Design a protein around this motif. Structure first.
Motif, short mmCIF file in Angstrom:
data_model
loop_
_atom_site.label_atom_id
_atom_site.label_comp_id
_atom_site.label_asym_id
_atom_site.label_seq_id
_atom_site.Cartn_x
_atom_site.Cartn_y
_atom_site.Cartn_z
N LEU C 130 -2.23 -3.89 0.13
CA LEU C 130 -3.12 -4.27 -0.97
C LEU C 130 -3.02 -3.28 -2.13
CD1 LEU C 130 -6.23 -5.45 1.16
CD2 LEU C 130 -4.53 -6.89 -0.09
N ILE C 131 -2.93 -1.98 -1.84
CA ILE C 131 -2.73 -0.98 -2.90
C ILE C 131 -1.42 -1.24 -3.64
CG2 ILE C 131 -2.21 1.42 -3.34
CD1 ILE C 131 -4.26 2.01 -1.06
N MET C 133 0.32 -3.97 -3.89
CA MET C 133 0.29 -5.22 -4.66
C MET C 133 -0.57 -5.07 -5.92
SD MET C 133 -0.08 -8.21 -1.83
CE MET C 133 0.35 -9.62 -2.82
N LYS C 134 -1.67 -4.35 -5.83
CA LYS C 134 -2.58 -4.19 -6.97
C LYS C 134 -1.94 -3.28 -8.01
CE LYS C 134 -6.12 -6.88 -6.06
NZ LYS C 134 -6.85 -7.71 -7.04
N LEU C 135 -1.23 -2.24 -7.60
CA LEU C 135 -0.51 -1.45 -8.59
C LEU C 135 0.47 -2.33 -9.35
CD1 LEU C 135 0.02 1.75 -6.50
CD2 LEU C 135 -1.14 1.74 -8.74
N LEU C 136 1.23 -3.17 -8.63
CA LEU C 136 2.25 -3.99 -9.28
C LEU C 136 1.62 -5.03 -10.21
CD1 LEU C 136 5.25 -4.64 -9.54
CD2 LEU C 136 4.95 -6.28 -7.65
N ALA C 137 0.53 -5.65 -9.79
CA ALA C 137 -0.07 -6.73 -10.55
C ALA C 137 -0.89 -6.22 -11.71
CB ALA C 137 -0.96 -7.57 -9.64
N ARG C 138 -1.15 -4.93 -11.74
CA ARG C 138 -2.16 -4.31 -12.59
C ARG C 138 -1.89 -4.68 -14.04
NH1 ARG C 138 -2.95 0.97 -15.10
NH2 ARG C 138 -0.70 0.89 -14.79
N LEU C 153 -9.92 0.44 -3.05
CA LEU C 153 -8.96 0.47 -1.95
C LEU C 153 -8.54 1.89 -1.63
CD1 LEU C 153 -6.76 -2.46 -3.11
CD2 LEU C 153 -7.85 -2.34 -0.87
N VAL C 154 -8.24 2.68 -2.67
CA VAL C 154 -7.78 4.04 -2.43
C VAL C 154 -8.91 4.85 -1.79
CG1 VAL C 154 -6.90 6.14 -3.50
CG2 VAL C 154 -6.07 3.90 -4.24
N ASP C 155 -10.15 4.59 -2.17
CA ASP C 155 -11.26 5.28 -1.53
C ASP C 155 -11.43 4.83 -0.08
OD1 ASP C 155 -11.60 6.62 -3.86
OD2 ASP C 155 -13.41 5.52 -4.50
N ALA C 156 -11.19 3.54 0.19
CA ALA C 156 -11.25 3.06 1.57
C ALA C 156 -10.05 3.48 2.41
CB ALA C 156 -11.36 1.54 1.60
N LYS C 167 5.25 4.08 0.91
CA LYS C 167 6.44 3.45 1.48
C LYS C 167 6.59 2.03 0.97
CE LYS C 167 6.62 6.24 5.75
NZ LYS C 167 6.73 6.07 7.22
N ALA C 168 5.48 1.30 0.83
CA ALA C 168 5.57 -0.07 0.35
C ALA C 168 6.06 -0.11 -1.10
CB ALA C 168 4.20 -0.74 0.46
N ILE C 169 5.57 0.82 -1.93
CA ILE C 169 6.01 0.88 -3.31
C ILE C 169 7.49 1.19 -3.36
CG2 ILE C 169 5.96 2.45 -5.27
CD1 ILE C 169 2.88 2.63 -4.76
#
Lengths: 184, 51, 194
Positions: C130-131, C133-138, C153-156, C167-169
């Motif tokens: 989710l992190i 994907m949200k960075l990419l879609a931002r 998300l980053v806090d969670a 790694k996903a990025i």
């Protein structure tokens, strides 16, 4: 549905007290643009001064609301807002948060939401003005984007005039809302 | 003859109910030894907090 | 409840079709943190190729879904996503993401089964994915919820979540789906402002 119950009850209570009021916040934003998960019920109430706001709050405390918080401010209207709980959901009553509460209540449109649930709902233009001022609470930026995307040319001009009025009354917190509006 | 604005507000009410249920399920996971009353107490505290 | 009805139905339908899928977007965030969502139910589906994506959509069109939009790109995976209406602007809609971020197979494989609503168990993308994907879609202009979802998300996120997001990025970027951007550097700059 706890929010539906709260909306129904506060609508009946404010109407029984013949108050000049309008739904604002996330449910009004949803009505005027794109629906979103919202849990606060926010309502503008037009009253003349702090004494009248206090009198309304005192009456509501006798009708099974309790005072969760009050927003004080260094201005002529010392009472910007109160946060009330059911003795279900939070209701925020806004008296002097943006300075155009009278116009917001006067311009709001009665909508029949569900059977036996009718509420004045603030106009798109007034929500744009409120959300521009409140921008900070990250959901305000998203609400503002949605409202602008839904707005008509006339809504845009009406928002401009509302923002001018916020500034003329000294509620612009030293910001150039007109400049910020040119960018949206 | 429900207006578009009313349709959107009715959808937002449905969204609130789903979000409340999602919060309830999550709190149950995060607090597995919590009884129903404790979870509902947590749900009640949740609404009262600001955005 | 029209939101609940659609979530339950799409979950049942994709699972009945034995798809490799995962809830993403606001509904996934809302399973892992304070709820924040709109009428779009976003779901990653890992399919072999564009033919397989189109075959799934065609199948769903026979199951009372209506196609509202298709998102295409100049890439070997031409079909990035589709938008499906489940009914006839106050409508819950389903976005199926096939090749929007380039790590859809990984997202579906790592997804966690979570009872998101009573008796509704759905695969939910990891916080790490989710992190990413949200960075990419931002898009702070048109999609400010992406940046606010990001803070939450980053806090969670656990340490594992942070490592797996990095790694996903990296895998998005290796595959060329990063839209010529340095997502890790964007993250660092955004998180400094936290």
């Amino acid at each position: 549905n706890a929010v539906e119950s709260t909306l129904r009850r506060v609508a009946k209570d404010l109407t029984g007290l013949r108050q000049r009021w309008a739904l604002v916040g996330g449910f009004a934003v949803s009505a005027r643009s794109e629906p979103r998960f919202t849990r606060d019920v926010d309502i503008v109430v037009a009253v003349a001064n702090d004494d009248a706001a206090e009198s309304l709050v005192r009456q509501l405390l006798t009708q099974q609301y309790h005072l969760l918080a009050s927003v004080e401010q260094d201005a002529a209207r010392r009472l910007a807002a109160v946060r009330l709980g059911a003795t279900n959901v939070v209701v925020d009553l806004l008296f002097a948060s943006c300075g155009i509460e009278p116009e917001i209540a006067e311009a709001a449109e009665e909508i029949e939401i569900l059977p036996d649930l009718v509420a004045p709902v603030a106009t798109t233009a007034h929500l744009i003005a409120m959300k521009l001022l409140a921008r900070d609470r990250p959901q305000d930026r998203s609400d503002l984007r949605a409202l602008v995307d839904a707005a008509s040319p006339q809504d845009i001009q009406d928002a401009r005039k509302a923002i001018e009025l916020i500034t003329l009354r000294g509620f612009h917190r030293d910001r150039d809302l007109a400049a910020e509006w040119t960018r949206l | 003859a429900v207006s578009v604005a009313a349709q959107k507000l009715r959808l937002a009410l449905d969204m609130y109910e789903v979000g409340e249920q999602m919060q309830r399920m999550r709190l149950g996971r995060e607090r597995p030894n919590a009884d129903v009353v404790e979870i509902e107490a947590a749900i009640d505290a949740w609404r009262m907090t600001r955005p």
